[model samples]
Structure formats: C-alpha cells, structure tokens
Target chain A: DKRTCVSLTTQRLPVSRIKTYTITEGSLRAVIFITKRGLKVCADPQATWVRDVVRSMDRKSNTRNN
Target chain B: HSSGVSTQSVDLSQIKRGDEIQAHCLTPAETEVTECAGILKDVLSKNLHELQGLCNVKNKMGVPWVSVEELGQEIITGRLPFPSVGGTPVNDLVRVLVVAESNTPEETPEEEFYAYVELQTELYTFGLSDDNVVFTSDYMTVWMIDIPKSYVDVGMLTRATFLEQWPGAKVTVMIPYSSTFTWCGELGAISEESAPQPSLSARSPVCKNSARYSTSKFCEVDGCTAETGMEKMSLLTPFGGPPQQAKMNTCPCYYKYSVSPLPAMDHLILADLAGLDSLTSPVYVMAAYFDSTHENPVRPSSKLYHCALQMTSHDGVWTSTSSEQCPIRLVEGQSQNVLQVRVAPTSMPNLVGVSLMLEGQQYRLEYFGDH
Candidate 1:
C-alpha cells in the first residue's frame, strides 16, 4: 500500500532516454523519471540537474507537438 | 551553428528583469560566448545572504544600502585602506571574488535537511520488523501459491512444494526474539532428547547472613514482652563488610518492636479510637529517618532512608519499632524521626508525630501525642 518513494538520488538521467516523468505530491517531493527501458528512477525535485533534464524533455515534446 | 546564430539575433534591449538577464546570459554562454555567465546566473538567482558571501565583502553602507556611517567608521579605523588610483579595475575584483567563491564545494540546504530527516527515520526504525522487502529491479514478478490444506491445519508448510515449484530457491523463516516462548521447532512433534534438562546448580553463592535476630535485653524498657523478644532483622551491610565501630565492644544503635497489653487488644482500641470498622481495620506504623539539619515536615527521598516498623502495644499506648540494627556510625549526623500511625480502614485520618531515642535520651511516641 506504500506507494511513496522512501529515498531519492541526485543522479541525473539523460533527457533523450527519459520517455516521461511524474512528480510526487507526498511530503517528500520527488520526480520519478520513466526511461525508454521502463526503468523508474527516483530523483529529488529540488535538484538543479533534475530540473534541467525535466525542462529539456518538456521543450522537446512541446516543439514536436506544436 | 544556426542555433548559435539565432541566439545572437535575440536583442539584449528586451532584458528587463534579473531572471531575463540570466536566461540570455546562459544562452550565449552555452554558445561559447562568455565563461563568466555561469557565475552571473548564480549571482542573480541567489539571495542577498549568498550574494554577499559570493562577493566576499561586508555591507559597508549598512541599512538602506546607502548609509555613510559604516563606511566612515571603516575609514576612521583605517581598515578600508585606499588602493592606488585605478591599480585594479572594479570588474576585476568582482571576477576574483566570484571565481574564488565558486571554487569551493557547494552545499545544498535542502539536501542537508532531508539527509537529517532520513537519518532520524532510520534510527527510529532500528528495532522495528523488516517486513518491507526492498526491490531495486526494474520489474518484479510475484508468484502466489495456495498453501495445501494439510499444511494450513498444522500451521506449517513443508519445503517439498517450494523445491518442486521453484528449484534452487532459498527459503528463510524469521522468528521474533522474545522471552514469552521457550522454544521453536519446525517438526510436528518435539523429541524428549532435544529438550534441555532443568538446571539444579546455582550460578552464585547463597547468602549466609541471618535474616532474624534475638531482641536485646534493653527492649524490655520499651515494653517488649518476653515472648516478643525475636524479630525479623535486616542489616544495612550494602556493599562492603560491617562498619569497624560496630565490630567493637560498643553496642550498635538498633530499633525494635514492643507492645503494652498485646497487639490483638490494641487493634480493637485503635479501630474504635479512629472511628473505623473493627473487622476491616489494620494498624500500620511508618518511621521515617531524616537529617537533624533539615527543616520541619521533612520529605522522604532515596537519600533519606525510611522503613515500616512492626506494630505492637507498649505500656498503655500502642507502639511500633524498626527491627533494624542501624549502626550509629552509619548515620552519625542524620538522626530525626517522623512517625506515622496509620489505621488501614478506608478514610481513617492518619496520626503523625516525631519520636526517637538516641544517645540515652528517651523520646516516647503515641498516636494521641500529636493528633
């Protein structure tokens, strides 16, 4: 029943390989990066590297759709 | 190459806010335009606390960022030495300070706070059950096997089913560590050969000191009858051997029980005097030892010793005494008493007083003496 992330890493992921991402709304805010291989990596939302990767992915998706 | 050309075409005149300046600066820096853009971005994003730290300078202007008093103080104190006219440009000082600050390792406040929380949570769950299996795999498969009826009835499952279903799979059963259960077994029946024998040998030596002692001949003065001359005694030989002075010819100061008519007759008299039911009432005597230097109504503490004395009748009044041979050397300066006469029938008022005999002086105690 416990779905929240108990821990988070500062390890950055490549924006190109990350298919999608989801932000946790729990007490410990985290960004779950879903890569092409369907691997789930929990990352701290406040991390600058994570923020940059998420921004780059969002920009790529937006440009393709628009 | 075209993206770099496009970034150059963006007009700098549109830059209004600090964030806009940082964004434009970062774009050009990414296109190999300037190396100091990263430092400028940090300077613009950071609060004044971090900005001052990065600049490595004190706020000489003070409040309003324009006050002259602080600068004047620095000048008067000769701490702000004037540099040679234009020896180094202001921009060069900024670059030196920012670069120096950037060279040091950065510490994130959020990461530090979260790390503390993680450590606290880990410590809090140290003794808890480790039921939650942590899986680092990208995908995990769960295989649920319905246990056989025979195993369910006996509250045990055999290894045969697991061996056949998943070859080479290791199974581990964990039992909680506690004092409630004597032994745990996997077999349906426990063998007598496996059971341990009842231990008969003592791990430590038995105490040889007597717990009962004969009352002294001087107890008769306190009205102790000839038949009541024996009492249960508790010597205060806590750690080491008995006191050296007690081993000498001098008699150890002791407390003993004494009665006047008898304990049986005094119970009826005490019940009637205290307005208690005769069948339900029981008499209790508590004698508290206190230091003479302490104030009135001395409270009982672990440091201030007290004990419940055996009650009996003495002369005309009911009395209770401590069956303890308290060496005078053990309590040399601390000698005072707060005697409490308690009738155990519910709601009976307790009678309290001070009575103790020390150094040949007689201090008689009675319930009516202080009530």
Candidate 2:
C-alpha cells in the first residue's frame, strides 16, 4: 500500500535464495546438544538440576576425555 | 619364513629365551564403564523414588525396598543373602536362565540354577580351584541366590520377576560379579562373532587373493596390531574393530616383560618364558626367525628348530626369548623365510625367564621375579 513493493520484491528475490531465507521477528538459532556422557534429568530448565550434575562430576576424580 | 628382522648368523652367547619383558597395549579414554555408571544413576533414581513410596501407589502390595531387597522380602526364605555389588577388584555376577526345561538332575533332588559366581573381595590369597588352568589364585567367595519369585508355574519366563526369599541375612553384591572377590577373565568375550556370514552369489565371478572365505575383521582397538589384540578388556571383537577389549584365554601370559639387566639393543624381542598351555592361553608370536619351513614348503622343510624374540624396558636392559620349536617344518639350513602367525585376542605381557639355547651356554633370561 505504501510503495507497491509486491511485484518489485518478487522480481528482486532469487528463487534459490527465496527457498532458504525467511523473515522472522525473533532470534531463531536454537538447539540442545547432549554429549555421550552427562545426565538428562533436570530440576529446572536453566538452574539447580545442572548444579547437582556439576557437583557429582567434581566429587569424582577430575576426568578429561576425548 | 623371512622376517623383516633377520635371525641368522648372530652371536648367541649374549642373550637367551624365557626372559621376562613388559609388553604394552594402547588404552583409549573411552570405555563402557561410563555408560554403566549412567545406568546406575538411573537405577538409583528409581530406587529412591520407590523408597519414598512413589512405586507403592495408593493401595498396592509393592514393597518399600529396592528390587533386590523386595525380592528378599517376598520370598521370605532364610537360606539366601541380600544381593549386592561385589567389592573392589569386583567379580560382577551374571544372571542366566535355564535352557531345555532343565529338570533338577534327579540325583541331586534340588539343584539351584547355576551361573558361575566368583568371590568379589580379595584376601591375601585364597586356595581357589577352577575348571581351567594357566593357573593363579586370589581371594573369592561363591554364593547361590534363589530368585525370590519364579514364573516357572506359568508357561515360560523372559526376564520375568521371580519370587523367593532367603533368610540368611548376609550382605551380598547385587551386581553379580562386581568386585572384592573371585576371578574374572574366565568369561571370554560374551558377544557373538559371525564367521563368513555374507551371502555371495554363486554365479558371481570370484576375485583371486581376496578376503572372501576369511573374516577380515581387524581388532576394533585403535593403535593396536594383531599381536596386541589380547589387551582388549572384553571379547567383543567387532569386525575391522580398531578394537579395545581383549580375551583372557587368547591373551599371552608373559612372565618376561620389559625389566632390567640385559643391555638394550633395538629390534630384539625377548623370547617367551611362560609354559606352553594351549588349553589356557594362546601363543603370541613375539618374533620369529628367517628360516625355510615357513617360506618354502616345496621341498623337505629345514631343521632350524626355533626363532628368537627380544624385549626391552624403560630402564636400559635388552632381553631375548624364543619359542620351543617351529610348529611347522623348516627346510634344513634354509634361512630365507617369511612367515604368518596368529596373535592372541588379548595382549601378551612379558614371557617368563627361560634359557634361550643358542650354542648351549645359558645366560639366565634375567628378570627380577621370585619365580
């Protein structure tokens, strides 16, 4: 309505690029990766549950693995 | 057989066979012990839940104890002891089911299901006996835990919960062979090995000098050669394995390892000082000589009886050991030979100190052992 961008925008967008890119209002990179070692149960999503995990690992001898 | 390293015309007076030497195997940081620890954590979590009555429900007969203790309560028999994780240097237990509608052999009237259980704790030394020998002993205990509730009354059991109780009230390891007791390494790799199982087309043209009939599965451990295969912790030798575990029976029992006294010279492998017992451990071809029976079989095999091996220690001492006689025949006086030999599924340490026979005078295959 303001500047009749529909046709011009379509003409400028490359078909290959159009398929892969999309507009988003918020930040979108999100993934949760788990290692071969480590526990799954969490007391809280971002909090105390992980503290126990760290403590337990500390209680055991320090481990460094590939 | 012709060896990359030579075996002819060298002075024999210096080093001999049956000497002790230290063998080394590469160990990776990764092992199954961690996964096992994770499982233990989950088990403890559930056990804790049950202890707090989560498993009891509003109205149920589920006991307020661990699965092992609960079974003890349900069976109410005084002969059995509580299940436990065996102590340090553990002898973990294995649970096995009876096969073939196993009838208690009529002679014994009552025969508890048997799964070889060894003692988990160590005492200075115990007078122990076993079915096989390449023998050694350590402290151990053996017990028979009756499954508290058995589903034998029903058609069959596939890991079904059994009910039976023991009133003996003794502390025991819940994990069958986990430590403080008896010996392990008796159980070979408890996994399956598939021999030439691939189906090939009958009409397909076969390639010459291929691994067709042979299983070309190398050991799964990385940085491991066939000679060190016996160092794997278990027998689960995967194909092209870069293998990590080793088998005990397939492991070479080296009495002679890299120790001291002999002068250090490279390319020498000390010969074995261990007893020849194919029944217990397998032979590890530490080193072989360049001779005829191995390289050429077209004519009568020669008579160069044995080959020499060498080993060295962190401290500078070089020792040599040799095998008894060539298992195969050698063409008389033929020194041109290259041979192929089998390696143990486990690693062989040092051979015992035996006198290597060169031109007869024996220099003790020096090792610092009471033996």
Give the chain B TM-score for each candidate.
0.13, 0.17
TM-score of chain A of each: 0.87, 0.26
Cα RMSD, each candidate: 33.8, 28.8
Residue B246, candidate 2: Cα error in Å is 23
Fnat, one value per model: 0.00, 0.00
What ranges in model 2 sit over 4 Å off?
A: A1-66, B1-116, B119-269, B272-366
**Model 2 lDDT tens row, B1-371:** 10011112222132121011000000111222233223323433344221111100010011111133311112101111111111111212232111101123345422132222222222221111122111111211222221211211112211211112211111112211111111111111111221211111011111122222122232233212346533322221223332112122211222123122222222122222221111121112212122322435575333211123322121222222332442211111111111122222111122222212111111222222232
Q: For candidate 2, write residues A1-66 as lDDT tens digits.
A: 211111111001111111111122223221121223331111221233233334444444256322
True-vs-predicted CA distance for residue A30, candidate 1, Å:
0.6
- The residue pairs that clash in candidate 1, if any, are B259-B313, B259-B314, B260-B313, B260-B314, B260-B315
Off-target runs (Cα >4 Å) in candidate 1 are B1-371
At residue B39, candidate 2 shows an lDDT of 34
Q: What would the per-residue lDDT of candidate 1 be over residues B293-345, giving only the tens digit for each residue?
A: 44446643212222333322233233443335211111111111112232221
Question: Which one is best on TM-score?
Answer: 1
